[PDB]
Amino acid sequence: AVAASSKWLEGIRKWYYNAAGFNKLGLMRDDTIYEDDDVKEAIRRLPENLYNDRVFRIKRALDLTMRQQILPKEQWTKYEEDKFYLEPYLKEVIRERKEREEWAKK
Amino acid sequence: AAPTLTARLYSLLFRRTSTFALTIAVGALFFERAFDQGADAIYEHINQGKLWKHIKHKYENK
Amino acid sequence: MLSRFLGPRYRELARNWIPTASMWGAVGAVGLVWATDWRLILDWVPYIN
Amino acid sequence: ATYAQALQSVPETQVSQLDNGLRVASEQSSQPTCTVGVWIDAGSRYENEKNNGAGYFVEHLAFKGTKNRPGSALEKEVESMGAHLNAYSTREHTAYYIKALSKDLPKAVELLADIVQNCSLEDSQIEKERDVILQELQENDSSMRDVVFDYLHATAFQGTPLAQSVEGPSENVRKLSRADLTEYVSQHYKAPRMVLAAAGGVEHRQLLDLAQKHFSSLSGTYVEDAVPAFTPCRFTGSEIRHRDDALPLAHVAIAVEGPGWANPDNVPLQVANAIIGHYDSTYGGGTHMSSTLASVAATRKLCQSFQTFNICYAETGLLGAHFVCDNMSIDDMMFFLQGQWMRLCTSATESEVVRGKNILRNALVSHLDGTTPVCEDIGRSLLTYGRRIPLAEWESRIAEVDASVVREVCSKYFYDQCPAVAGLGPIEQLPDYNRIRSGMFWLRF
Numbered sequence: 001a002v003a004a005s006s007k008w009l010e011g012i013r014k015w016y017y018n019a020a021g022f023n024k025l026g027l028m029r030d031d032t033i034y035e036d037d038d039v040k041e042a043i044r045r046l047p048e049n050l051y052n053d054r055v056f057r058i059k060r061a062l063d064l065t066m067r068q069q070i071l072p073k074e075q076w077t078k079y080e081e082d083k084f085y086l087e088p089y090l091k092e093v094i095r096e097r098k099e100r101e102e103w104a105k106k
Numbered sequence: 107a108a109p110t111l112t113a114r115l116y117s118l119l120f121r122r123t124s125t126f127a128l129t130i131a132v133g134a135l136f137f138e139r140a141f142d143q144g145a146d147a148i149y150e151h152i153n154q155g156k157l158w159k160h161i162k163h164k165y166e167n168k
Numbered sequence: 169m170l171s172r173f174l175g176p177r178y179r180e181l182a183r184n185w186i187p188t189a190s191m192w193g194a195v196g197a198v199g200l201v202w203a204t205d206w207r208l209i210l211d212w213v214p215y216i217n
Numbered sequence: 218a219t220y221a222q223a224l225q226s227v228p229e230t231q232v233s234q235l236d237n238g239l240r241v242a243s244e245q246s247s248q249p250t251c252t253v254g255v256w257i258d259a260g261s262r263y264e265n266e267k268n269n270g271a272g273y274f275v276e277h278l279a280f281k282g283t284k285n286r287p288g289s290a291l292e293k294e295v296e297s298m299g300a301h302l303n304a305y306s307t308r309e310h311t312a313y314y315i316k317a318l319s320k321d322l323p324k325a326v327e328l329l330a331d332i333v334q335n336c337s338l339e340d341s342q343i344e345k346e347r348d349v350i351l352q353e354l355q356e357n358d359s360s361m362r363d364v365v366f367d368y369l370h371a372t373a374f375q376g377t378p379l380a381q382s383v384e385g386p387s388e389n390v391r392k393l394s395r396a397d398l399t400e401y402v403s404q405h406y407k408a409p410r411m412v413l414a415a416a417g418g419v420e421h422r423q424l425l426d427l428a429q430k431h432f433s434s435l436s437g438t439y440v441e442d443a444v445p446a447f448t449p450c451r452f453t454g455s456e457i458r459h460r461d462d463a464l465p466l467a468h469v470a471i472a473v474e475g476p477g478w479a480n481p482d483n484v485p486l487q488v489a490n491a492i493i494g495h496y497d498s499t500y501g502g503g504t505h506m507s508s509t510l511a512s513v514a515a516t517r518k519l520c521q522s523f524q525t526f527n528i529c530y531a532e533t534g535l536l537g538a539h540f541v542c543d544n545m546s547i548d549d550m551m552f553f554l555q556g557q558w559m560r561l562c563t564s565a566t567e568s569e570v571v572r573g574k575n576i577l578r579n580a581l582v583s584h585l586d587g588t589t590p591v592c593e594d595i596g597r598s599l600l601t602y603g604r605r606i607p608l609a610e611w612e613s614r615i616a617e618v619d620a621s622v623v624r625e626v627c628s629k630y631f632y633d634q635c636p637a638v639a640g641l642g643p644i645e646q647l648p649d650y651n652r653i654r655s656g657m658f659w660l661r662f
Contacts, residue, residue: 101172105174122188128194131195135201139215139217177567180566181566184565188661
C-alpha cells in the first residue's frame with residue numbers, strides 16, 4: 001500500500017529478526033521449518049554440497065542447548081547474508097499437488 | 107424354474123446386508139409375544155389347582 | 169480447507185450411498201423398541217401390545 | 218472429413234448362395250493383393266472321447282500331399298509364385314487360407330478346392346507324423362501361460378464336452394488309427410458348414426463363377442440324417458492347485474460365468490473391462506497411469522504383469538483376469554483385484570465411462586488394417602451371426618451406454634457368485650476357498 005512509510009516497516013523487519021533467536025545459535029532461517037510431507041520431498045532434491053551443510057549446522061546448533069551457552073557475538077549470522085536456499089525447491093512440490101487435485105475433481 | 111419358497115425369499119430381503127439386517131430386528135419382535143404366551147400356559151395346566159390363583163376365588167367380590 | 173470433498177464427481181456418489189443409509193435409521197427405530205421396551209411406539213403397532 | 222462421414226463410406230459386403238447351399242462372400246478395395254480361404258465348423262467340442270485328439274491330426278497333414286500333386290509337387294508350385302499357407306484349430310474353429318498376388322487368383326482357388334474335397338491319407342506317412350506330435354507335447358509343457366488356461370476349462374465344465382482339450386490326451390494319440398481319420402472328415406466336412414471368403418482386389422462376379430466350376434460335387438447331405446444339437450451346458454465353482462516349489466514365479470487365473478455370442482449384454486461388458494486395464498514391468502510412466510491396478514502395483518513393486526480376458530461360445534462364457542507374481546505377494550493382488558470389482562457394481566462414476574468408451578472404439582478401427590485381418594473377420598461372422606455387422610452399427614450401440622447401465626450389468630454377473638480358480642507353483646499363500654468366496658460381497662452393500 002504505502003511506500004514512503006514502508007521504510008518504517010523495513011525497520012520492524014530488522015526488529016523481529018533480532019527478537020527470535022535462531023541467529024544466536026548459529027542458524028539460518030530455512031533450518032527451522034516444520035517438516036510435514038510436502039517438505040519431506042523437497043529436501044530429497046538437494047545437491048549434495050548443500051545437504052551436508054544443513055546437517056553440520058544443526059548438529060552443532062543443538063548441542064549448545066544441552067550445554068546452555070551460546071556462541072560468540074562476532075559469530076552471529078548477519079542479517080543480510082542469510083540465504084533462502086530452499087524456497088525454489090519447495091514452490092514446485094506444492095504446485096504439482098494442486099494439479100493432481102483439479103484432475104480428480106473436475 | 108418352478109418357484110421354490112426360497113427362490114423369491116432370497117431376492118426380496120436377503121441381498122446386500124441391509125434388508126438382511128432389518129428382518130433380524132423385526133423378526134424377533136413378532137416372535138416374543140407368541141413365544142411368551144404358549145410357554146406359561148403349559149405350566150398352569152400341568153398342575154392347576156395347587157397354585158395360589160386356583161383357590162383365591164374363595165376370596166373375591168365378597 | 170474442506171474443499172477436498174467438494175467436486176463434480178464427489179457430490180454425485182452421495183446418491184450411490186443414500187439408499188443404503190436412508191434405511192439405516194429404520195433398523196434403530198425397530199430395534200430400540202425391542203431392546204429398551206418402548207411403549208409409545210409399541211402402542212402404535214396393533215400386533216404387539 | 219468428420220469421423221461421422223468416414224464410417225459410412227466403407228465398401229459393403231456381398232453374399233450369395235449355391236444350389237448345394239454353400240455361402241460365398243467377398244469385398245473389394247482396389248489394390249494389388251488378395252487373400253482367400255475356407256472357414257469350417259468343427260473343433261474338439263464336437264467329438265466323443267474315443268475321438269478326443271482326431272481333428273488336430275488332420276490339419277497336421279493337409280500340406281503333405283494330395284491325389285494329383287503327390288507330395289513335394291505341391292509346395293514347389295506355391296513357392297515359384299511367392300505365396301504362403303497356414304492352418305490353425307480351436308475348440309469350435311478350423312481354417313485354411315492363402316496369400317498371393319492378385320493375378321494368380323484362378324490358380325489359388327484350384328489349390329484350396331483340391332485339398333478340402335479329396336485328400337490322401339497315405340499310410341507309412343502316418344506313423345511319422347505321430348512322433349513329431351508326441352514330442353510336440355513336451356515342448357509346450359514348459360510354457361506356463363498355456364498350461365494354466367488348460368486347467369480352467371477342466372475345472373469349470375467338469376462333466377461336459379467343452380472340458381476336453383484341443384490336442385487330446387497323450388494316450389489316445391499313441392493308438393489313434395488310420396481308419397478313424399476318415400469318418401471325422403466325412404461327417405463334419407460339408408456345406409453349409411463351410412464358408413468361402415476373400416478380400417483385396419477381388420471381384421465378386423468371377424469369384425462366384427469359379428465357385429461353380431470347382432465346387433459342384435461337394436456332398437451337402439448329412440450322414441445318417443444326423444444333425445448336431447448343443448446343450449446349454451453347466452458351470453460350477455471349483456478349484457485346482459499344483460505346487461512345484463522350484464520355479465521362480467507364480468501364475469494365477471480366476472473367472473465367473475458370462476454371456477454367449479448373440480447376447481446383447483456383451484457390449485457394456487467390454488466398456489467395463491477396459492476400465493481395469495493392463496500392465497507390464499517395461500511401460501513408461503507406470504506410477505502415473507489411470508488404473509487402480511496399474512498405478513499401485515508400480516509404486517510398490519508387486520507384480521510383473523496382468524490382463525483381463527473374456528472368452529465366449531454358443532452357450533457359455535468366461536470373465537476374469539491373470540497375473541504373474543512373486544511368492545511373498547500373492548494375497549495383496551487378490552485384495553486389490555476384488556476391491557475394484559465390487560467398487561464398479563456399487564457406485565461407479567460418470568467420467569470413468571467416457572474414457573472407457575473411447576478405448577473400445579479405437580481397438581475396433583485399428584484391428585481391421587491389412588488383408589489377412591479383414592478376410593478373417595468376414596468368414597467368422599457368417600458362422601456366428603449371419604449378416605456381417607457393419608461399422609456404422611457398432612457405433613450406435615456404443616452411443617447407448619451410460620453410468621447406470623454399467624452398474625446393473627455388473628451386479629447381475631459379479632455380486633454374490635461362485636468363482637473358479639487355477640494356480641501354479643510356488644503357492645502356499647494363496648488363500649483358502651472360504652476366504653476368496655467372502656470377498657464377493659461387501660458387508661455394507
